[PDB]
Design a protein around this ligand. Structure first.
Ligand code: 4NP
Length: 159
């Protein structure tokens, strides 16, 4: 087939604040655009195992609920083997990218990229989805705006 079903994995450090939000929003945008048929797996993970088994940060959940975006997730860690199970392994910031590239096996199919690679750079949003941990609910809302923006760009540019 010329239009293969795509598998996407969103990565952050804890799979607690940003990546579960990225997965939730991306699935939401796929559904709104009736593009389910173009995707196999859409998941989120963390480079660390610090929040394995836990539901997302209450602030990420509150932001998703405020926008009417469903979210249901338990923390999980990205592994070297996953690089052959996903077409895109998308990090939030450069520190995520650094770690992913160091565990990326040679020849694996996944393309490691920054979600912000899909930014238009037209000034609407910043490219790096910054860790909101030490910030507050506004930083989480901004991550939501960034992720929604890149999700729509990704759907328009990669399919
Ligand atoms: O404690 N922390 O610094 C911390 C913990 C979990 C986080 O979640 P992430 O956005 O999925 O990496 C982000 C930051």
């Amino acid at each position: 087939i010329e239009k293969p079903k795509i598998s996407v994995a969103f990565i952050a450090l804890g799979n607690f604040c940003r990546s579960p939000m990225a997965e939730a929003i991306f699935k939401h945008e796929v559904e709104k655009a009736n593009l389910e048929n173009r995707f196999n797996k859409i998941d989120s993970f963390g480079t660390s195992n610090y929040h394995v088994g836990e539901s997302p940060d209450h602030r990420t959940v509150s932001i998703c609920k405020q926008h009417g975006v469903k979210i249901n997730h338990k923390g999980k860690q990205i592994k070297t083997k996953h690089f052959d199970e996903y077409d895109y392994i998308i990090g939030m910031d450069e520190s995520n990218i650094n770690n992913l590239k160091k565990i990326q096996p040679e020849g694996s199919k996944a393309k490691v990229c920054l979600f912000g690679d899909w930014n238009t750079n037209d000034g609407t949003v910043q490219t790096i989805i910054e860790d909101p941990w030490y910030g507050d609910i506004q930083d989480f809302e901004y991550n939501f705006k960034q992720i929604t923006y890149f999700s729509k760009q990704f759907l328009k540019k990669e399919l």
